[PDB]
Scaffold this motif. Structure first.
Motif, PDB file in Angstrom:
ATOM      1  N   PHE A  82     -12.043 -10.632  -0.720  1.00  9.45           N
ATOM      2  CA  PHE A  82     -13.061  -9.765  -1.293  1.00  9.45           C
ATOM      3  C   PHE A  82     -14.207 -10.569  -1.899  1.00  9.45           C
ATOM      4  CE2 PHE A  82     -11.367  -5.784  -0.141  1.00  9.45           C
ATOM      5  CZ  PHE A  82     -10.008  -5.993  -0.016  1.00  9.45           C
ATOM      6  N   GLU A  83     -14.133 -10.947  -3.169  1.00 12.82           N
ATOM      7  CA  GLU A  83     -15.241 -11.694  -3.780  1.00 12.82           C
ATOM      8  C   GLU A  83     -15.670 -12.920  -2.958  1.00 12.82           C
ATOM      9  OE1 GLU A  83     -12.622 -10.594  -5.556  1.00 12.82           O
ATOM     10  OE2 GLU A  83     -13.691  -8.981  -6.613  1.00 12.82           O
TER      11      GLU A  83
ATOM     12  N   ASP B 261     -13.805  -3.873  -2.487  1.00 15.35           N
ATOM     13  CA  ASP B 261     -12.693  -3.013  -2.152  1.00 15.35           C
ATOM     14  C   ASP B 261     -13.127  -1.567  -2.349  1.00 15.35           C
ATOM     15  OD1 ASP B 261     -11.076  -3.976  -5.179  1.00 15.35           O
ATOM     16  OD2 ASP B 261     -11.734  -1.926  -4.768  1.00 15.35           O
ATOM     17  N   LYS B 262     -12.269  -0.643  -1.933  1.00 13.39           N
ATOM     18  CA  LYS B 262     -12.630   0.754  -1.795  1.00 13.39           C
ATOM     19  C   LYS B 262     -12.884   1.455  -3.137  1.00 13.39           C
ATOM     20  CE  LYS B 262      -7.768   2.392  -1.208  1.00 13.39           C
ATOM     21  NZ  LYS B 262      -6.798   3.066  -0.266  1.00 13.39           N
ATOM     22  N   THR B 263     -12.375   0.915  -4.252  1.00 12.13           N
ATOM     23  CA  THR B 263     -12.563   1.604  -5.534  1.00 12.13           C
ATOM     24  C   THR B 263     -13.058   0.760  -6.704  1.00 12.13           C
ATOM     25  OG1 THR B 263     -10.281   1.288  -6.311  1.00 12.13           O
ATOM     26  CG2 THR B 263     -10.765   3.284  -4.995  1.00 12.13           C
ATOM     27  N   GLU B 264     -13.408  -0.497  -6.488  1.00 14.11           N
ATOM     28  CA  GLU B 264     -13.848  -1.325  -7.607  1.00 14.11           C
ATOM     29  C   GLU B 264     -15.151  -0.818  -8.220  1.00 14.11           C
ATOM     30  OE1 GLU B 264     -14.397  -5.140  -5.043  1.00 14.11           O
ATOM     31  OE2 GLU B 264     -15.938  -5.192  -6.605  1.00 14.11           O
TER      32      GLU B 264
ATOM     33  N   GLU C  77     -15.779   2.112  -9.024  1.00 21.79           N
ATOM     34  CA  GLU C  77     -15.358   3.054 -10.069  1.00 21.79           C
ATOM     35  C   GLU C  77     -15.243   2.323 -11.403  1.00 21.79           C
ATOM     36  OE1 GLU C  77     -11.482   4.959  -9.389  1.00 21.79           O
ATOM     37  OE2 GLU C  77     -11.645   6.230 -11.174  1.00 21.79           O
ATOM     38  N   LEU C  78     -14.745   1.095 -11.338  1.00 19.03           N
ATOM     39  CA  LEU C  78     -14.588   0.292 -12.550  1.00 19.03           C
ATOM     40  C   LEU C  78     -15.967  -0.079 -13.095  1.00 19.03           C
ATOM     41  CD1 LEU C  78     -11.607  -2.057 -11.439  1.00 19.03           C
ATOM     42  CD2 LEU C  78     -11.554   0.220 -12.470  1.00 19.03           C
ATOM     43  N   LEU C  79     -16.838  -0.570 -12.210  1.00 17.05           N
ATOM     44  CA  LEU C  79     -18.159  -1.027 -12.617  1.00 17.05           C
ATOM     45  C   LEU C  79     -18.926   0.143 -13.214  1.00 17.05           C
ATOM     46  CD1 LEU C  79     -20.229  -3.432 -12.542  1.00 17.05           C
ATOM     47  CD2 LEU C  79     -20.942  -2.546 -10.325  1.00 17.05           C
TER      48      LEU C  79
ATOM     49  N   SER D 106     -17.787   2.717 -14.713  1.00 19.67           N
ATOM     50  CA  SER D 106     -17.267   3.129 -16.019  1.00 19.67           C
ATOM     51  C   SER D 106     -17.928   2.351 -17.147  1.00 19.67           C
ATOM     52  CB  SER D 106     -15.738   3.004 -16.125  1.00 19.67           C
ATOM     53  OG  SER D 106     -15.297   1.660 -16.258  1.00 19.67           O
ATOM     54  N   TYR D 107     -18.483   1.179 -16.848  1.00 20.00           N
ATOM     55  CA  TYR D 107     -19.201   0.433 -17.856  1.00 20.00           C
ATOM     56  C   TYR D 107     -20.526   1.114 -18.159  1.00 20.00           C
ATOM     57  CZ  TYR D 107     -15.944  -3.352 -16.655  1.00 20.00           C
ATOM     58  OH  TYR D 107     -14.828  -4.127 -16.391  1.00 20.00           O
TER      59      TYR D 107
ATOM     60  N   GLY E  33     -18.803   5.367 -19.089  1.00 16.34           N
ATOM     61  CA  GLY E  33     -17.551   5.604 -19.797  1.00 16.34           C
ATOM     62  C   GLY E  33     -17.722   5.655 -21.295  1.00 16.34           C
ATOM     63  N   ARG E  34     -18.801   5.035 -21.767  1.00 14.73           N
ATOM     64  CA  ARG E  34     -19.189   5.051 -23.169  1.00 14.73           C
ATOM     65  C   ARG E  34     -20.683   5.294 -23.239  1.00 14.73           C
ATOM     66  NH1 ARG E  34     -15.598   3.132 -26.585  1.00 14.73           N
ATOM     67  NH2 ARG E  34     -17.126   2.518 -28.182  1.00 14.73           N
TER      68      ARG E  34
ATOM     69  N   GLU F 136      -5.599  -1.992  -0.325  1.00 15.34           N
ATOM     70  CA  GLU F 136      -6.060  -2.735   0.832  1.00 15.34           C
ATOM     71  C   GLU F 136      -5.365  -4.091   0.867  1.00 15.34           C
ATOM     72  OE1 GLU F 136     -10.622  -2.229   1.036  1.00 15.34           O
ATOM     73  OE2 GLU F 136      -9.898  -1.312  -0.794  1.00 15.34           O
TER      74      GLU F 136
ATOM     75  N   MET G 115      -5.894  -7.027  -1.802  1.00 14.16           N
ATOM     76  CA  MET G 115      -6.672  -6.415  -2.867  1.00 14.16           C
ATOM     77  C   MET G 115      -6.207  -6.892  -4.245  1.00 14.16           C
ATOM     78  SD  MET G 115      -6.923  -2.373  -3.581  1.00 14.16           S
ATOM     79  CE  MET G 115      -8.437  -1.518  -4.001  1.00 14.16           C
TER      80      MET G 115
ATOM     81  N   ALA H  65     -12.511   2.066 -25.195  1.00 14.52           N
ATOM     82  CA  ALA H  65     -12.211   3.403 -24.709  1.00 14.52           C
ATOM     83  C   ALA H  65     -13.284   3.880 -23.739  1.00 14.52           C
ATOM     84  CB  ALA H  65     -12.080   4.388 -25.847  1.00 14.52           C
ATOM     85  N   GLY H  66     -12.835   4.420 -22.616  1.00 15.62           N
ATOM     86  CA  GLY H  66     -13.720   4.933 -21.595  1.00 15.62           C
ATOM     87  C   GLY H  66     -13.953   3.977 -20.437  1.00 15.62           C
ATOM     88  N   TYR H  67     -13.800   2.685 -20.680  1.00 14.73           N
ATOM     89  CA  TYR H  67     -13.900   1.715 -19.593  1.00 14.73           C
ATOM     90  C   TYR H  67     -12.593   1.755 -18.802  1.00 14.73           C
ATOM     91  CZ  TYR H  67     -17.922  -0.463 -21.969  1.00 14.73           C
ATOM     92  OH  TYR H  67     -19.137  -0.741 -22.570  1.00 14.73           O
ATOM     93  N   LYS H  68     -12.687   1.588 -17.486  1.00 17.25           N
ATOM     94  CA  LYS H  68     -11.509   1.694 -16.628  1.00 17.25           C
ATOM     95  C   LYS H  68     -10.963   0.347 -16.192  1.00 17.25           C
ATOM     96  CE  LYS H  68     -12.790   6.153 -14.677  1.00 17.25           C
ATOM     97  NZ  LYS H  68     -13.265   6.873 -13.461  1.00 17.25           N
TER      98      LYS H  68
ATOM     99  N   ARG I 217      -7.323  -1.183 -13.773  1.00 19.63           N
ATOM    100  CA  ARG I 217      -6.595  -0.916 -12.540  1.00 19.63           C
ATOM    101  C   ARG I 217      -5.151  -1.345 -12.659  1.00 19.63           C
ATOM    102  NH1 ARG I 217      -9.101  -3.349  -7.144  1.00 19.63           N
ATOM    103  NH2 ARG I 217     -10.358  -1.432  -7.299  1.00 19.63           N
TER     104      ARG I 217
ATOM    105  N   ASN J 183      -6.915   3.540 -10.699  1.00 18.72           N
ATOM    106  CA  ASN J 183      -7.803   3.115 -11.771  1.00 18.72           C
ATOM    107  C   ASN J 183      -7.696   4.137 -12.892  1.00 18.72           C
ATOM    108  OD1 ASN J 183      -8.807   0.923 -10.115  1.00 18.72           O
ATOM    109  ND2 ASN J 183     -10.388   2.279  -9.288  1.00 18.72           N
TER     110      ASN J 183
ATOM    111  N   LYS K 121     -12.264  -5.825 -13.791  1.00 17.65           N
ATOM    112  CA  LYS K 121     -13.221  -6.739 -13.164  1.00 17.65           C
ATOM    113  C   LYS K 121     -14.389  -6.953 -14.124  1.00 17.65           C
ATOM    114  CE  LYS K 121     -15.845  -7.921  -9.067  1.00 17.65           C
ATOM    115  NZ  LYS K 121     -15.998  -7.842  -7.614  1.00 17.65           N
TER     116      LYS K 121
ATOM    117  N   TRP L 163     -11.635 -11.002 -11.917  1.00 17.65           N
ATOM    118  CA  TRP L 163     -10.585 -10.115 -12.388  1.00 17.65           C
ATOM    119  C   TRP L 163      -9.752 -10.758 -13.487  1.00 17.65           C
ATOM    120  CZ3 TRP L 163     -10.196  -5.126 -10.599  1.00 17.65           C
ATOM    121  CH2 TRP L 163     -10.976  -4.825  -9.463  1.00 17.65           C
TER     122      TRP L 163
END
Ligand SMILES: *[C@@H]1O[C@H](CO)[C@@H](O)[C@H](O)[C@H]1NC(C)=O
Ligand SMILES: [Cl-]
Ligand code: NA
Lengths: 30, 251
Positions: A9-10, A16-19, A21-23, A25-26, A29-30, B8, B11, B132-135, B137, B156, B204, B211
């Motif tokens: 990946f990197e 990847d298919k859902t990373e 979503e993490l980014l 949330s920054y 998410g707040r 994946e 992953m 809180a609120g940050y995700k 995995r 996630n 991440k 990660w």
């Protein structure tokens, strides 16, 4: 020293298919 | 993993399966933090109420896996344990406080496309990301509902405000734990479940694209219940101990 950077990946500039979503949330998410 | 999806390939290349030798069975998740150290939950190795107290020759770890059950000859590596180290103040009698253990492998594992270590957070990374609120995995081969997956699962989940975590359980929680999962009012689902414990909760970093393992899957009351959350060992809080062990017993 190379921790946390994934060969399939990197290291290949592939996401990847859902990373995103993490980014995102920054942003949202707040 | 409840309400996740198939990982994946490659992953989660730090994913480790903790395996009982005899009889052969999946016990827990775990993670690769260097070429000869693996991180897991103490309760995966030691839980006296269930006469669980493994010695090193009782176990193996399997690294680089995707399938739960197939022997993946060209990609997985099976390693023996040299020594188990359990936090001395692991509190199994009360609340699973300091639910953390390290395992040193008998020989270093070669990294590959499928096998690669996760980073552990520094103080500022933990301060910035564990909000809180940050995700993050969670990954594992645990049950799909409170029923086993064919391949590694991923979900996630958002970190939850400490007062909400506290109010969700009668267990005495500590600052060495955090909780994660959706609230009922968020109308989404997902959790760790039986077999996922010991595995990693990762994030991440937006600062360096790496990660980091922020948590260890520790405990929950059921799986994916409304108004309940998964509890995770706070890796940064325990990093002083991790460093002490690795400094003393050798990288
Ligand atoms: C676990 O087993 C080891 C090895 O036999 C033993 O020495 C130790 O006392 C046991 N620990 C506990 C807490 O039962
Ligand atoms: Cl609601
Ligand atoms: Na829940």
């Amino acid at each position: 020293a190379d921790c946390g950077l994934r060969p399939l990946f990197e290291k290949k500039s592939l996401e990847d298919k859902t990373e995103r979503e993490l980014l995102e949330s920054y942003i949202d998410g707040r | 993993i409840v309400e996740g999806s198939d990982a994946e390939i490659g992953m989660s290349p730090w994913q480790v399966m903790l395996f009982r030798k005899s009889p052969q069975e999946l016990l827990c998740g775990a993670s690769l933090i260097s070429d000869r150290w693996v991180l897991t939950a103490a309760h995966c190795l030691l839980y006296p109420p269930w006469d669980k107290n493994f010695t090193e020759n009782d176990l193996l770890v399997r690294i680089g896996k995707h399938s739960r059950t197939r022997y993946e000859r060209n990609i997985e590596k099976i390693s023996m344990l040299e020594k188990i180290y359990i936090h001395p103040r692991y509190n199994w009698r009360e609340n699973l406080d300091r639910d953390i253990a390290l395992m040193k492998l008998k020989k270093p594992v070669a990294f590959s496309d499928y096998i690669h270590p996760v980073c552990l957070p520094d103080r500022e990374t933990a301060a910035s990301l564990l909000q809180a609120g940050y995700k993050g995995r969670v990954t594992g081969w645990g049950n799909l509902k409170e029923g086993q997956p064919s391949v590694l699962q991923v979900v996630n989940l958002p970190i939850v405000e400490r007062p909400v975590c506290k109010d969700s359980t009668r267990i005495r929680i500590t600052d060495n734990m955090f909780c994660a999962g959706y609230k009922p009012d968020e109308g989404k689902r997902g959790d760790a479940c039986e077999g996922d414990s010991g595995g990693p909760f990762v994030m991440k970093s937006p600062f360096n694209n790496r990660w980091y393992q922020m948590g260890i899957v520790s405990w929950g009351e059921g799986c994916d219940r409304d108004g309940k959350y998964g509890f995770y060992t706070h890796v940064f809080r325990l990093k002083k101990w991790i460093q002490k062990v690795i400094d003393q017993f050798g990288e």
